[PDB]
Amino acid sequence: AVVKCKPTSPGRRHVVKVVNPELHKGKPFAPLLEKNSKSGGRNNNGRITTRHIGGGHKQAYRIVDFKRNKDGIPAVVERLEYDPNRSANIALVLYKDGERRYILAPKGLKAGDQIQSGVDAAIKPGNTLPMRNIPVGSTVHNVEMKPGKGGQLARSAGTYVQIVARDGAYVTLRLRSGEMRKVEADCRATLGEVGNAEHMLRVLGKAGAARWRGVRPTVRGTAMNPVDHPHGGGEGRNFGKHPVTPWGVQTKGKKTRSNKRTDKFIVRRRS
Amino acid sequence: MKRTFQPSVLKRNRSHGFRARMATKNGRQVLARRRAKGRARLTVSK
RNA sequence: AAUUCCUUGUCGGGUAAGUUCCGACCUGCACGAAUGGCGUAAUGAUGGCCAGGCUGUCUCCACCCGAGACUCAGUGAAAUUGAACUCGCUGUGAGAUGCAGUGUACCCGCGGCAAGACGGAAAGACCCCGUGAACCUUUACUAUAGCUUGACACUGAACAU
RNA sequence: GCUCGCCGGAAGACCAAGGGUUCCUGUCCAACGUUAAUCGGGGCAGGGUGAGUCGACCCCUAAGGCGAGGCCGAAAGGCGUAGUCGAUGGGAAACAGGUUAAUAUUCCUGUACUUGGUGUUACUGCGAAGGGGGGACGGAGAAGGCUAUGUUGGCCGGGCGACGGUUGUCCCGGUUUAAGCGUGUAGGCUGGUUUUCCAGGCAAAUCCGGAAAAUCAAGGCUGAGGCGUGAUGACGAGGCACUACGGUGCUGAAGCAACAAAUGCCCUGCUUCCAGGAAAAGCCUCUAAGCAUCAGGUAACAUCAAAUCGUACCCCAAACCGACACAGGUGGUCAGGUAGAGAAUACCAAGGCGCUUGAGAGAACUCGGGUGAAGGAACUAGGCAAAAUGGUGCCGUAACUUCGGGAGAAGGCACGCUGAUAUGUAGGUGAGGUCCCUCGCGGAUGGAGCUGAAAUCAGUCGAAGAUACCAGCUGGCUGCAACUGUUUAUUAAAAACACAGCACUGUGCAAACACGAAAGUGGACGUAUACGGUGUGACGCCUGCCCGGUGCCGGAAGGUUAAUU
RNA sequence: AGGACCGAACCGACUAAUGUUGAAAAAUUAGCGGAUGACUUGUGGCUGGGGGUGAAAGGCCAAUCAAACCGGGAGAUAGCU
C-alpha cells in the first residue's frame, strides 16, 4: 500500500512508503541464500567502471528460479518475501516433491495459490509455459530470450510483455519499452505481470535514502573544471557547448546501439 | 597532529618485505641493485 | 535586484541627521521562465538592516590580581654583517652618518620608543622582455586513439529474376 | 619525614599497535638532562621475562592476493579455474590465594577443567573430498528479572579525645572469599510421540524436506542470577615471640542483613521497522563406494602426551608517530564517594603527580584576568571583543505555516532552611507468621523492617535560596539556498557541491557505458517501475515565442566523392 | 518514528586573542557546529602518475600536486643574469 508519512522532520515530509503486510515478517529461506559482496562499481582492475555506486545496506542474494524447468509438478505458494536484490517481490513455493524455490511474485499471487510449469500447465498467473502454447494477445513476464537459459525480460516490479503475434517458430512481443521484438516459439514465459506495481510511486524523500540503496552522489560536470569534464567550468555558469558524456559523447539523442549481430529480432525498435 | 608514518610491521613486510620484492620482476631488480651497491640491509624484513 | 553605468535614481518609512536597510515607482545602461522564473513555512557558526537588554566598545581611562619585562646566580641561541674613529641642518649629487659649507657635540653603559639606516626576510607574484615553460580552451595548424563507410581476405553451396 | 597544592571518565589502573631492555640491583657524573645533580628512560656491570588452560602458531574462512593447467598478450606480462594463502571474524579447556628487588591465571599451595594417543573391559553398524542440520549474524526501541558496585544498619575490634562538649542515637577501621561441580529458577523458544508413503536434497540415505493417519497433552531445548558445595580452608583489622625496626614463624575476632543499583548479564532474547542484515570449519546427524567371528564406533577405568614462539618495561606517553625528555596525535578495557538528569561540573577516595632553571624586585609596555563613578554603541567597516541571558515546575505564548511547526516564541510567578500534616506521607521493597500445594528457587495472604519523593500550611535567616561550578540573549524586516549534510588537510564552510524531486536522452541484455592492445571484469548474478549520461534542484503557482545557425534524430530523387578496377 | 531536539564522550573547525627565529613546519585558550547518522572509529585490503580518487576545491594521492616521488636520458637548453 502507498502511504505518505507526516512532516515531523525535514526528510519525512515527501517520503512515500510502499508497505505490503502480505510480505513475510521473518527470516528468508537459508538454503536459497548466498553471499553477495558489494563492488563499489569497481572491476577486477580496481578502477571505477560505473560511477555512483558505493555503500548501502548489506544484502544476501536469493537464488531465484528464472528457468522454471520443474514441469508436471504442482507448487503451492508458502509466503511472499522481500528481496533487496530487485524491485519485485519473490514468492517461496513448495513443490509436491518437497523442493522449495524462489520465483518472482506475479500481480495477484497469494499464499496458497497453486502454480505449475510445462506445456500441460493451465493458463493462469504464475504458470510458466513455452510461448508456443501461450495464447496470442496475453500478458506474460520473466520471458526467455533463448530456450533453456532463463527469463531475462519483464522481471522488474510491474513489468510485462504482450504476445502480439506468432508467425512460425518465432513469436512477436511488445516489450515494456515499446520495442517490438520476436523470440523463438520455445522460450518459456510466465503468465501475468510482476506484482509490485506500487514500487514506482515510492518517494525516497531524502538523500540518505539513496545512500541506503548504494547510490553515491552524482556530480554534474558543469560544476567541475575542464580537466575533469568537457562541460568543465567557466567564470560562473557558462556551459556553452553541446551536452556530452565524460569521454565525449552527445547524450542528447545520439543513438549508440552498434550491435548489428541480431538485426533481425527488432521490428519496431521504439517510439 | 596525525603524521604520515603510522608504523605497522605487517604492512611494512607485505609492502616492502623480501618476499614481496621477490614476487615481481622489478622487485627482484631492486634487490639486484642493492646487492650490487653492497647494502647491508637488502630489505626491511627484520 | 547577488543584475541599475548614469546614481547617494524619485517618493515614502525608520533616525535630530540613513550612499546602507525596508516598501513602492519603472527611465530593466545590461531580469526572465529547468545553464529554470516568481513565491515559500522551516532550517542556516550564511549576507544586510532595525530595536530591547547588556556592558570599559567608546566619552576616558583608573585601580587591583597573576605570567613576563627589570636585578642576581646557572645555562646559553638566532636572523644579520664590505669595512667603520656610525651627529644635525642646508645644499650638492636626481630623498647623504660618510661630499661642500655650517652648527652642535667630554668617554662608556642600562632601561625604554621605533622616525631613518631607501632597516631584516624571499634573485618583484604587478609591468615588460625571452622567437622561455607548463596546464587549459576552441569552427587555430598538423596528427591521432576511438567511432564509422566500403573493397579484399577468413568466405561456401545451389535456385530464381 | 611532617605539611601544602594538583589530577581523579585521569595527570589513576590493565592491554593492543608500535618501540625493543627503556624493567630491577649495584656503581659512576665526563658527555646526554635546556640549571645544579649525590639523581635519571644517561654511562658501566650484573640480574631479570618459567604456561596443556592467556596470546600466537594451529583448524576455518571474509575482503583481497597468489594461482597447476587454461584463456589472452610483441617480450615483459595480464586475467582466472581447480586449488592455496589471507583476520580485523568463527573454532577445546584455570580459578582464588600466596610469593620475587625485578615474572606469574606461567612459580608455589589448594581446588579444577579440556582435547587427543595407547591399553583393558563390556556393548556394538563403522565408514566421505558427498547430503542435511547447526554454526549464522541488521537497526531502533521497550520494559521486566539480576549482578558488579554502593549506602545504611547490625556484628567484631579499637578509641573517649592538644580548646567548650563528647560512655552515646558518639568516633575510626574491618565485615572479603573464585573457577569448577551440583541444583536448572526469573524468563525465552517450540506442540510432542509412533507408523506408512514420496517426481526433491547431482547416487544413496534410518537424516532433512514433503504427504496422509493414529495416539497424548506434558515433552524437550535454551537460560542470567540465586542457593549448596568448593571452604573444619584461604584471606583477615590487629596481636604474641624473634624484631640489623629491612621483616619474618605462630596466632588472628566479626566475616551477617536490608536497601539502592547499572551503559554490564539473562539478551545471538522480546517488540517493531525497512535500508531486509558474512563465509567456512569445528560440532551434531545421514548414508555411498567399501569393511564385518576383523577394522572401526560407544561408555567406563588406567596410563601417556599437550610441543614450539611471545610473556620484562612504556603504552593518551619523557620509552609509540611528531628531528627534542616537543602544551600536538594515538585504538580497546576497568568506571568509587557527595551533589547532580548525567561518563557534564565542583570537591574528594583508591592511586598518582607538583609538569628539570631558581632567587628577588613589584617601572613602562605586553600577555591572561577581576572591579568600576556618570553615561550606555556616542566605539567601529561591523556591537569585533566583552558584558549579558542561562536551571526546574506552573501559568502563558503572535504573525506566518507545507498544520508537523513557529515555540524553550515572547513574558510572568514560585524555588533556601526548620517543623507539622506524616514520631518518614503517597509510592517502592518485602521478612516472620498463617493457609494452600503437582511438598518447590512454588503460590496466596500477611504486613514487620528498610528505603523514600513531591506538595500544602506555618515559622525562620540573609542584600541576595536555579546563591558556587554548571547553565538559551531576545525580538522585528529582508537577500540567497529548501532542508540534514559536503568542500579548498595548511589564509575562502559560502549564496558553491550534494540532496530528495523533475525532465530530456541513451540502453532489449553478449545492454548502453566504463577499465582493458586482448582475454576478461564492472554495470548485474540486475533486465526498461532496470541501468547509464546530461541538466535542473524540496514544495507551491508555472515554465511563453523562435529549428535560420550549430548539434542530434530521420529521409532520399539527384549531385559530389576513397581504396579498388 | 525521526539524515528530530538540548547536550558530554567522539568527530568537526565559525569567531576572537595569543603565538608567528612558536610549546607546535597550522597549535593553544575562551566560545562555536554535528553528536542514531549521507555518523564515527580500529585492523586489513583495492584503485598508480596524463593515471588514480574526488557530495568537485583543480581538492587529495607520505609536511611535495594545473600532472607525485626516485633513478636515468643529462653536463637537456638558457640569444638571459
Curated annotation (Swiss-Prot), chain A:
Which domain of life does the UniProt lineage start with? Answer: Bacteria
> Which stretches of sequence are listed as region Disordered?
27-52, 220-271
| N6-acetyllysine: residues carrying this PTM | K241
Q: What does this protein do?
A: One of the primary rRNA binding proteins. Located near the base of the L1 stalk, it is probably also mobile. Required for association of the 30S and 50S subunits to form the 70S ribosome, for tRNA binding and peptide bond formation. It has been suggested to have peptidyltransferase activity; this is highly controversial. In the E.coli 70S ribosome in the initiation state it has been modeled to make several contacts with the 16S rRNA (forming bridge B7b, PubMed:12809609); these contacts are broken in the model with bound EF-G.
Do you know which Pfam families this protein is assigned to?
Ribosomal_L2, Ribosomal_L2_C
Annotated Gene Ontology cellular component terms: cytoplasm; cytosol; cytosolic large ribosomal subunit; DnaA-L2 complex
Give the UniProt keywords, A-Z: Acetylation, Ribonucleoprotein, Ribosomal protein, RNA-binding, rRNA-binding
Q: Could you confirm whether the keyword Nucleotide-binding appears in this record?
A: no
Recite the other comments.
Answer: This protein can be partially replaced in vivo by its H.marismortui (HmaL2) or human (L8, from the 60S cytoplasmic ribosome) homolog.
Family to which the UniProt record says this protein belongs: Belongs to the universal ribosomal protein uL2 family.
Asked if the record carries the keyword Nucleotide-binding, the reply is no
| Quaternary structure and interacting proteins, as annotated | Part of the 50S ribosomal subunit. Forms a bridge to the 30S subunit in the 70S ribosome, contacting the 16S rRNA. Interacts weakly with S6 in one of the 3.5 A resolved structures. In pull-down experiments interacts with CedA.
Q: What is this protein called?
A: Large ribosomal subunit protein uL2
Read off the PROSITE patterns from this record. Answer: RIBOSOMAL_L2
In the record, biological process GO terms are: cytoplasmic translation; negative regulation of DNA-templated DNA replication initiation; ribosomal large subunit assembly
Q: Where is the signal peptide?
A: none
**Record note on what altering H229Q does:** Loss of peptidyltransferase activity in reconstituted ribosomes. No change in rRNA binding or assembly into ribosomes
What does the record give under GO molecular function?
RNA binding; rRNA binding; structural constituent of ribosome; transferase activity; zinc ion binding
Q: Which portions of the chain have biased composition (kind: Low complexity)?
A: 38-47
Swiss-Prot record, chain B:
Query: Keyword Transmembrane, does the record have it?
Result: no
This protein's source sits in the domain of life called Bacteria
Alphabetical GO CC annotations of the entry are: ribonucleoprotein complex; ribosome
One of the protein's GO biological processes: translation
InterPro entries (alphabetical): Ribosomal_bL34, Ribosomal_bL34_CS
Signal peptide positions (record): none
In alphabetical order, the GO MF annotations are: structural constituent of ribosome
Ordered alphabetically, the record's keywords are:
Ribonucleoprotein, Ribosomal protein
Which PANTHER family does this chain map to? LARGE RIBOSOMAL SUBUNIT PROTEIN BL34M, MITOCHONDRIAL RIBOSOMAL PROTEIN 34 FAMILY MEMBER
Question: Which family does the UniProt entry place this protein in?
Answer: Belongs to the bacterial ribosomal protein bL34 family.
What is the protein name given in its UniProt record?
A: Large ribosomal subunit protein bL34
- Give the species: Escherichia coli O45:K1 (strain S88 / ExPEC)
